[PDB]
């Protein structure tokens, strides 16, 4: 096994769940918590930017603190024979204690210091 976790805790940690008929937008909130004694920049990525929306898109979390990220998944024509192809990814790196620019942290960040984790999109019907 060659898979490992980022500094940020995620909730749900495994996969993003979308429950509702897909005739309209589904809203799914993801809770991200920081276990560390340091500030950390976060970013969200998705498989389709015209089918998934992420209100914050990115930010910074304080030591011991939590941020809730709302995902808005757009309506589509679901098929019971078709399989889910969609995923989410969250990227994180440590921020310095004295900056006013979050983009500069990602430009000073190295490919060996950058953390990420990945999650699938799950689809569930109301059945009522």
């Amino acid at each position: 096994g060659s898979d490992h976790e980022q500094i940020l805790v995620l909730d749900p940690p495994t996969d993003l769940k979308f429950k509702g008929p897909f005739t309209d937008v589904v809203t799914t909130n993801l809770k991200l918590r920081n276990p560390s004694d340091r500030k950390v920049c976060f970013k969200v990525k998705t498989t389709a930017p015209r089918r998934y929306c992420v209100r914050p898109n990115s930010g910074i979390i304080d030591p011991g603190s939590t941020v809730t990220v709302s995902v808005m998944l757009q309506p589509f024509d679901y098929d019971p024979n078709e399989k889910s192809k969609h995923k989410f990814m969250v990227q994180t790196i440590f921020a310095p204690p004295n900056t006013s620019d979050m983009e500069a942290v990602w430009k000073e960040a190295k490919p060996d210091e950058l953390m990420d984790s990945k999650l699938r999109c799950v689809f569930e019907m109301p059945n009522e």
């Binding site: 998705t46 015209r50 998934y52 992420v54 192809k85 969609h86």
Partner: protein, 44 residues
């Protein structure tokens, strides 16, 4: 409804990838892409 004063960065990328990850916008305003199709088709 939702939006920001400056957003939607990142362009000109092309790589081999299992699903293609994108930088997940705050909200969708311009689906797919623009093109030359106007007021039906052909009749040139």
């Amino acid at each position: 409804p939702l939006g920001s004063d400056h957003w939607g960065k990142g362009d000109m990328s092309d790589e081999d990838d299992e699903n293609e990850f994108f930088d997940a916008p705050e909200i969708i305003t311009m689906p797919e892409n623009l093109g030359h199709k106007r007021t039906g088709s052909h009749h040139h």
